Design an enzyme around this catalytic site. Structure first.
Site, PDB file in Angstrom:
ATOM      1  N   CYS B 108      82.374  64.982  25.839  1.00 21.84           N
ATOM      2  CA  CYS B 108      81.232  64.624  26.678  1.00 21.84           C
ATOM      3  C   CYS B 108      80.515  63.389  26.133  1.00 21.84           C
ATOM      4  O   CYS B 108      79.992  63.405  25.010  1.00 21.84           O
ATOM      5  CB  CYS B 108      80.257  65.797  26.788  1.00 21.84           C
ATOM      6  SG  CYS B 108      78.760  65.330  27.621  1.00 21.84           S
ATOM      7  N   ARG B 111      76.062  63.242  25.514  1.00 18.28           N
ATOM      8  CA  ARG B 111      75.414  64.189  24.616  1.00 18.28           C
ATOM      9  C   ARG B 111      74.124  63.679  23.985  1.00 18.28           C
ATOM     10  O   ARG B 111      73.447  64.463  23.315  1.00 18.28           O
ATOM     11  CB  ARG B 111      76.380  64.611  23.523  1.00 18.28           C
ATOM     12  CG  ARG B 111      77.453  65.546  24.030  1.00 18.28           C
ATOM     13  CD  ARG B 111      78.376  65.968  22.905  1.00 18.28           C
ATOM     14  NE  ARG B 111      79.378  64.923  22.677  1.00 18.28           N
ATOM     15  CZ  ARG B 111      80.147  64.868  21.602  1.00 18.28           C
ATOM     16  NH1 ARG B 111      80.016  65.789  20.656  1.00 18.28           N
ATOM     17  NH2 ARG B 111      81.047  63.887  21.480  1.00 18.28           N
ATOM     18  N   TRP B 280      74.042  64.765  35.285  1.00 20.80           N
ATOM     19  CA  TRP B 280      74.093  63.732  36.301  1.00 20.80           C
ATOM     20  C   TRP B 280      75.352  62.895  36.064  1.00 20.80           C
ATOM     21  O   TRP B 280      75.935  62.906  34.978  1.00 20.80           O
ATOM     22  CB  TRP B 280      72.843  62.847  36.299  1.00 20.80           C
ATOM     23  CG  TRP B 280      72.476  62.219  35.007  1.00 20.80           C
ATOM     24  CD1 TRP B 280      73.034  61.091  34.449  1.00 20.80           C
ATOM     25  CD2 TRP B 280      71.433  62.630  34.121  1.00 20.80           C
ATOM     26  NE1 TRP B 280      72.411  60.799  33.257  1.00 20.80           N
ATOM     27  CE2 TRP B 280      71.423  61.727  33.037  1.00 20.80           C
ATOM     28  CE3 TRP B 280      70.514  63.687  34.126  1.00 20.80           C
ATOM     29  CZ2 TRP B 280      70.527  61.850  31.976  1.00 20.80           C
ATOM     30  CZ3 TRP B 280      69.626  63.803  33.072  1.00 20.80           C
ATOM     31  CH2 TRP B 280      69.633  62.890  32.018  1.00 20.80           C
ATOM     32  N   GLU B 285      83.090  58.411  37.131  1.00 18.58           N
ATOM     33  CA  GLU B 285      83.657  59.687  37.544  1.00 18.58           C
ATOM     34  C   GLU B 285      83.969  59.683  39.032  1.00 18.58           C
ATOM     35  O   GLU B 285      85.012  60.190  39.456  1.00 18.58           O
ATOM     36  CB  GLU B 285      82.711  60.840  37.206  1.00 18.58           C
ATOM     37  CG  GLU B 285      82.449  61.017  35.706  1.00 18.58           C
ATOM     38  CD  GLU B 285      81.444  62.133  35.467  1.00 18.58           C
ATOM     39  OE1 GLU B 285      81.882  63.293  35.561  1.00 18.58           O
ATOM     40  OE2 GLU B 285      80.243  61.854  35.224  1.00 18.58           O
TER      41      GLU B 285
HETATM   42  C1  HEM Z   1      73.230  64.586  31.257  1.00 23.05           C
HETATM   43  C2  HEM Z   1      74.148  63.783  31.788  1.00 23.05           C
HETATM   44  C3  HEM Z   1      75.646  63.974  31.472  1.00 23.05           C
HETATM   45  C4  HEM Z   1      76.533  62.989  31.578  1.00 23.05           C
HETATM   46  C5  HEM Z   1      76.224  61.527  31.991  1.00 23.05           C
HETATM   47  C6  HEM Z   1      77.823  63.523  31.205  1.00 23.05           C
HETATM   48  C7  HEM Z   1      79.000  62.827  31.194  1.00 23.05           C
HETATM   49  C8  HEM Z   1      80.222  63.437  31.075  1.00 23.05           C
HETATM   50  C9  HEM Z   1      81.471  62.858  31.492  1.00 23.05           C
HETATM   51  C10 HEM Z   1      81.633  61.462  32.143  1.00 23.05           C
HETATM   52  C11 HEM Z   1      82.434  63.715  31.205  1.00 23.05           C
HETATM   53  C12 HEM Z   1      83.932  63.518  31.498  1.00 23.05           C
HETATM   54  C13 HEM Z   1      84.208  64.349  32.753  1.00 23.05           C
HETATM   55  C14 HEM Z   1      85.575  64.087  33.341  1.00 23.05           C
HETATM   56  O1  HEM Z   1      86.179  63.022  33.071  1.00 23.05           O
HETATM   57  O2  HEM Z   1      86.090  64.938  34.107  1.00 23.05           O
HETATM   58  C15 HEM Z   1      81.838  64.901  30.611  1.00 23.05           C
HETATM   59  C16 HEM Z   1      82.518  66.009  30.161  1.00 23.05           C
HETATM   60  C17 HEM Z   1      81.903  67.156  29.687  1.00 23.05           C
HETATM   61  N1  HEM Z   1      80.530  67.400  29.653  1.00 23.05           N
HETATM   62 FE1  HEM Z   1      79.010  66.033  29.905  1.00 23.05          FE
HETATM   63  N2  HEM Z   1      77.692  64.870  30.903  1.00 23.05           N
HETATM   64  C18 HEM Z   1      76.347  65.187  31.055  1.00 23.05           C
HETATM   65  C19 HEM Z   1      75.803  66.445  30.863  1.00 23.05           C
HETATM   66  C20 HEM Z   1      76.419  67.564  30.346  1.00 23.05           C
HETATM   67  C21 HEM Z   1      75.832  68.881  30.186  1.00 23.05           C
HETATM   68  C22 HEM Z   1      74.372  69.232  30.609  1.00 23.05           C
HETATM   69  C23 HEM Z   1      76.771  69.684  29.660  1.00 23.05           C
HETATM   70  C24 HEM Z   1      76.690  71.169  29.237  1.00 23.05           C
HETATM   71  C25 HEM Z   1      75.505  71.768  29.046  1.00 23.05           C
HETATM   72  C26 HEM Z   1      77.981  68.893  29.449  1.00 23.05           C
HETATM   73  C27 HEM Z   1      79.174  69.316  28.915  1.00 23.05           C
HETATM   74  C28 HEM Z   1      80.371  68.671  29.116  1.00 23.05           C
HETATM   75  C29 HEM Z   1      81.680  69.220  28.813  1.00 23.05           C
HETATM   76  C30 HEM Z   1      81.936  70.620  28.210  1.00 23.05           C
HETATM   77  C31 HEM Z   1      82.594  68.310  29.154  1.00 23.05           C
HETATM   78  C32 HEM Z   1      84.130  68.464  29.028  1.00 23.05           C
HETATM   79  C33 HEM Z   1      84.634  68.767  30.440  1.00 23.05           C
HETATM   80  C34 HEM Z   1      86.089  69.159  30.449  1.00 23.05           C
HETATM   81  O3  HEM Z   1      86.654  69.403  29.351  1.00 23.05           O
HETATM   82  O4  HEM Z   1      86.678  69.238  31.562  1.00 23.05           O
HETATM   83  N3  HEM Z   1      77.720  67.633  29.905  1.00 23.05           N
HETATM   84  N4  HEM Z   1      80.471  64.694  30.541  1.00 23.05           N
HETATM   85  C1  LIG Z   2      77.661  68.411  33.368  1.00 23.33           C
HETATM   86  C2  LIG Z   2      78.598  67.275  33.731  1.00 23.33           C
HETATM   87  C3  LIG Z   2      78.111  65.991  33.923  1.00 23.33           C
HETATM   88  C4  LIG Z   2      79.005  64.972  34.274  1.00 23.33           C
HETATM   89  N1  LIG Z   2      78.562  63.704  34.469  1.00 23.33           N
HETATM   90  N2  LIG Z   2      80.313  65.253  34.440  1.00 23.33           N
HETATM   91  C5  LIG Z   2      80.809  66.493  34.255  1.00 23.33           C
HETATM   92  C6  LIG Z   2      82.069  66.743  34.382  1.00 23.33           C
HETATM   93  C7  LIG Z   2      83.214  67.043  34.442  1.00 23.33           C
HETATM   94  C8  LIG Z   2      84.648  67.390  34.441  1.00 23.33           C
HETATM   95  N3  LIG Z   2      84.981  68.260  35.564  1.00 23.33           N
HETATM   96  C9  LIG Z   2      86.235  67.849  36.204  1.00 23.33           C
HETATM   97  C10 LIG Z   2      86.509  68.795  37.369  1.00 23.33           C
HETATM   98  C11 LIG Z   2      86.472  70.267  36.951  1.00 23.33           C
HETATM   99  F1  LIG Z   2      87.510  70.558  36.191  1.00 23.33           F
HETATM  100  F2  LIG Z   2      86.513  71.020  38.026  1.00 23.33           F
HETATM  101  C12 LIG Z   2      85.217  70.592  36.164  1.00 23.33           C
HETATM  102  C13 LIG Z   2      85.136  69.611  35.007  1.00 23.33           C
HETATM  103  C14 LIG Z   2      79.951  67.523  33.901  1.00 23.33           C
END
Ligand code: HEM
Ligand SMILES: Cc1cc(N)nc(C#CCN2CCC(F)(F)CC2)c1
Ligand code: HEM
Ligand SMILES: Cc1cc(N)nc(C#CCN2CCC(F)(F)CC2)c1
Ligand SMILES: C[C@H](O)[C@H](O)[C@H]1CNc2nc(N)[nH]c(=O)c2N1
Ligand SMILES: C[C@H](O)[C@H](O)[C@H]1CNc2nc(N)[nH]c(=O)c2N1
Ligand SMILES: [Zn+2]
Lengths: 410, 411
Positions: B108, B111, B280, B285
């Site tokens: 992520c 963070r 957000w 994405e």
């Molecule tokens: C606050 C704004 C946030 C932004 C801008 C952000 C951004 C991102 C992005 C761009 C990804 C890659 C997603 C993808 O390529 O499919 C990601 C993954 C992830 N985010 Fe964040 N995120 C945010 C908030 C959060 C929050 C609130 C949580 C949990 C409380 C979180 C937990 C995760 C996790 C666990 C992943 C891995 C997803 C996966 O393995 O499929 N994120 N995030």
């Molecule tokens: C909290 C948050 C903020 C942000 N900007 N992106 C994400 C994401 C993601 C990844 N997503 C890909 C499709 C899925 F497998 F169905 C669920 C996981 C999450």
């Protein structure tokens, strides 16, 4: 332990068994992945024979003569030679095979579909830096081929005791100088500022321009290195213009046609070739994205965006991204117009997917470093972004080695 | 033991000690790196050391390690485990746990926000209808009329693995996909299998290109039930371009709220199989992956056509050119409608500052370079040039199998 790799765009699943023959270590552990670290930081008689044996075993397997008379004879003969001289010499055939497989095994190279079409120049009879220069000039001319580029490697004598090393001190045969300015900025290529110094400190007369081709600094038999100027008629350069923006000319950009890596070490059958310059042709992003737009290189994004009259106040206007595309259109356009071989990142990555499929089908795998294979622009619209890859170390191999000025007893 | 990572653009070197607290396995070995692989019930036996480790972390963070409150809580949890085989987190521990699972999510890039997370305790929920109410309140809170706020809603933890709470949607808000008889797909191809499940469960599908899917909610291991999110709670953004007036006529929109609902939250050995969380969007994405993956909406062609680019050879970079314009349009539309979004330049620069801070105050920051680097313009963002160490800390968010592959249907 018979691992699977999936392509998430096509669902194609390949099975990898080649990794079980991997030998050296990756830097990773079960507790930590170091896949994004750039560098996870003489053979004794006992170290050398297993290395030689494994190499000869795969060579004779590759010519459908495993366990043959010629095979066991050659192992005996090399075994005797190591017992006697504490080293051995490769047959021409084994040297060609080893070099082609060093390229084949280079997990960071996207251009490996070409791996078996490598011209190998045996320079093991070389004894002086003047001789090295001659060998290098012939390589450059052969490889450049008036712009129809051909892949080639030139292999100088192998390490003996470590005091008599052959080394090319340049990182590439052809690279532009870098100078520090009186004020504070840098003129030319900042990546080469230290090397540009050592050339001056050794006697070079620098034009102090932005694109001055550096001289060669050649080290034979462990002696002090000597400067030589590559004949300019052998250094093919491409002036960069844009197919839409006539003002692109005035930026004054050019690049060289021949990427020729000269600072790596080639390992074949335990033997170490510390001077082994090799060359192919460019993928356009190497120049337009990295050389031109890294903040620590020529760093031209600012300039190009201003000339495009882009909104450079907000990052969310994506003005850097827009200029970046246009720069890389121009690089490809320029090489193509002058009929110098170049490949765009879409064609190259498409070819690497076909190569992976060949290697999985005919070899059982293909070591690949995703961090390096995926291009530095437009990553996920190229097919390799969606391709899972396994990274592991096979030999014969190209390895990094210390810069020789930090090592040489001057 | 200490480990160093170098930023090759700034020569800044950081030292990682935090990886020593890592115990879960990465998938790599000394002889193979699986860094690009997407995916590399408990007994009282293994549960108390997991609880103790978590409670030690928790009381260290509040400057009470070894205190009487700490020792009594360990005692209380020990007895509760041996007599009931599980245990219940206090509200304070749950909030700490959810924030730290985000802080440890090495994939992520957002963070820097980890400590600003609204935690909604839904552990008293018992039915799918109750899950629906909790999820509506989360969506409305997090959306905040476009001024997005991060939030997580935590449903009851796993017990025997036969009474799981699950959200069957992969995201709370997502568009349907329909396979046509001619082999083409209408809508979002990523959601065809889930759309078919919803239809089979009784959803009347509008069969358009941007149909918000219904929620499919499983409480207490029962068969899941369909619910329609009130449309006034689903904020959407019509996509237009600041220079190209024809762009609106492509008919594109997207939703404002990214809310992942298929992951498992692990805190102190407890497993929360239903834990939707939202933040957000980063612009890429939507503009790169959702719109331009060949396996998703795949709009590169029609955009490049209307742009009238040279599409006969890839060396024109017509794909790269359309991709940039699409991503400009996504960011322009969201900002114009005052819906929170962050471009990939801003987001990666914040991440580097986050990461450096984490190395200073925490001794490390696990990060997955493969996921952190944006899917366009990689090396002109600072994370490209940043070495990263990837390792697994708990509390954590984990993948789990899709519920339809494991559920025993009651009928
Ligand atoms: C606050 C704004 C946030 C932004 C801008 C952000 C951004 C991102 C992005 C761009 C990804 C890659 C997603 C993808 O390529 O499919 C990601 C993954 C992830 N985010 Fe964040 N995120 C945010 C908030 C959060 C929050 C609130 C949580 C949990 C409380 C979180 C937990 C995760 C996790 C666990 C992943 C891995 C997803 C996966 O393995 O499929 N994120 N995030
Ligand atoms: C909290 C948050 C903020 C942000 N900007 N992106 C994400 C994401 C993601 C990844 N997503 C890909 C499709 C899925 F497998 F169905 C669920 C996981 C999450
Ligand atoms: C013929 C066309 C070729 C193409 C299009 C190509 C492409 C590339 C590219 C884009 C890189 C990444 C370079 C960087 O990011 O710094 C690379 C790396 C590499 N290539 Fe190839 N290459 C070609 C030929 C060759 C040949 C002939 C050899 C050896 C015989 C070779 C061996 C390597 C090695 C060892 C690396 C890793 C370099 C490093 O670690 O710094 N390549 N190649
Ligand atoms: C044979 C070949 C073909 C091709 N297309 N690219 C390359 C490269 C490179 C990048 N090179 C820069 C100088 C260095 F850092 F010292 C080593 C890495 C090599
Ligand atoms: C830190 C990171 O490993 C480093 O910037 C890498 C990333 N990927 C790369 N990929 C290629 N092809 N060439 C490079 O120099 C790099 N640099
Ligand atoms: C095979 C490869 O790991 C896969 O395509 C990954 C690459 N990096 C990614 N990075 C992000 N942020 N999101 C993704 O879905 C992926 N997919
Ligand atoms: Zn690894």
């Amino acid at each position: 332990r018979f691992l699977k790799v999936k392509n998430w765009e096509t669902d194609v699943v390949l099975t990898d068994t080649l990794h079980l023959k991997s030998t050296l270590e990756t830097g990773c552990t079960e507790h930590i992945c170091m896949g994004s670290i750039m560098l996870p930081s003489v053979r004794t008689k006992d170290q050398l024979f297993p290395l030689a044996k494994e190499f000869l075993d795969q060579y004779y397997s590759s010519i459908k003569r495993f366990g043959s008379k010629a095979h066991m004879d050659r192992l005996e003969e090399v075994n005797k030679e190591i017992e006697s001289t504490s080293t051995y010499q490769l047959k021409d055939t084994e040297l060609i095979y080893g070099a082609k497989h060093a390229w084949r095994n280079a997990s960071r190279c996207v251009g490996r579909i070409q791996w078996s079409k490598l011209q190998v120049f045996d320079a093991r009879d070389c004894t002086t830096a003047h001789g090295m220069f001659n060998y290098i000039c012939n390589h450059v001319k052969y490889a450049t081929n008036k712009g129809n580029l051909r892949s080639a490697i030139t292999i100088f004598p192998q390490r003996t005791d470590g005091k008599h090393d052959f080394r090319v001190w340049n990182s590439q045969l052809i690279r532009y100088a870098g100078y520090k300015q009186p004020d504070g900025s840098t003129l030319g290529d900042p990546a080469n500022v230290q090397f540009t110094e050592i050339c001056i400190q050794q006697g070079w007369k620098a034009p102090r321009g932005r694109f001055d081709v550096l001289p060669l600094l050649l080290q034979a038999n462990g002696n002090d290195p000597e400067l030589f100027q590559i004949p300019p008629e052998l250094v093919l350069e491409v002036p960069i213009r844009h197919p839409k923006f006539d003002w692109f000319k005035d930026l004054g950009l050019k690049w060289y046609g021949l990427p020729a890596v000269s600072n790596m070490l080639l390992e074949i059958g335990g033997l170490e070739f510390s001077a082994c310059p090799f060359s192919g042709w460019y993928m356009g992003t190497e120049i337009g994205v990295r050389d031109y737009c890294d903040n620590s290189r020529y760093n031209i994004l600012e300039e190009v965006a201003k000339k495009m009259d882009l909104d450079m106040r907000k990052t969310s206007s994506l003005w850097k991204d827009q200029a970046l595309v246009e720069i890389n259109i121009a690089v490809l356009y320029s090489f193509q117009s002058d009929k110098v071989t170049i490949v765009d990142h879409h064609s190259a990555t498409e070819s690497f997917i076909k190569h992976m499929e060949n290697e999985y089908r005919c070899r059982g795998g293909c070591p690949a470093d995703w961090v390096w294979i995926v291009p530095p622009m437009s990553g996920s619209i190229t097919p390799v972004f969606h391709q899972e890859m396994l990274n592991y170390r096979l030999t014969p191999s190209f390895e990094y080695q210390p810069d020789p000025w930090n090592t040489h007893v001057w």
